[PDB]
């Protein structure tokens, strides 16, 4: 969408949240594919336990990705954009998309995996655009701020 929406507000999206899992690297196709597979395996196990995966709302902006409980609108994760190293869609499953965020708590890389019926590609592009705008602001401040 426009700069202004990402820059001045946020873009909301609905998704299902398969979870997050620790990875060894901040990027890479293999890394994310191994994570998505791990979390698909876990989800399948959980479904055999009678569990649904949770629905979440994502708010994407130049400041980050907020993961909300969609009914309460209560923030469950705030992934500051400058701690997100990589975002990708899954070339062999349209609905899957992911990002890698370096954890506040632990120094570990966490890959967050999600499912969107219609918007996976669009969501991934939106986070890419956020990266682009935030980096341009960063350069224009001569490397400073937050």
């Amino acid at each position: 969408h426009t700069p202004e929406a990402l820059s001045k507000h946020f873009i909301p999206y609905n998704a299902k949240f398969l979870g997050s899992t620790e990875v060894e690297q901040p990027k890479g196709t293999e890394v994310v594919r191994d994570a998505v597979r791990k979390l698909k395996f876990a989800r399948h196990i959980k479904k055999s336990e009678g569990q649904k995966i949770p629905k979440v709302e994502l708010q994407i902006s130049i400041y980050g990705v907020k993961i909300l409980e969609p009914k309460t609108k209560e923030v469950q994760h705030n992934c500051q954009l400058h701690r997100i190293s990589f975002c990708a869609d899954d070339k062999t499953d349209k609905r899957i998309f992911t990002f890698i965020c370096k954890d506040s708590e632990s120094n570990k890389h966490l890959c967050y995996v999600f499912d969107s019926e219609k918007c996976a590609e669009e969501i991934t592009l939106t986070i890419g655009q956020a990266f682009d705008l935030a980096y341009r602001k960063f350069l224009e401040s001569g490397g400073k701020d937050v």
Partner: peptide, 12 residues
């Protein structure tokens, strides 16, 4: 189709 965040490296 993936994107690296250029800003990341400077905040680590």
């Amino acid at each position: 189709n993936g994107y690296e965040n250029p800003t990341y490296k400077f905040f680590e």
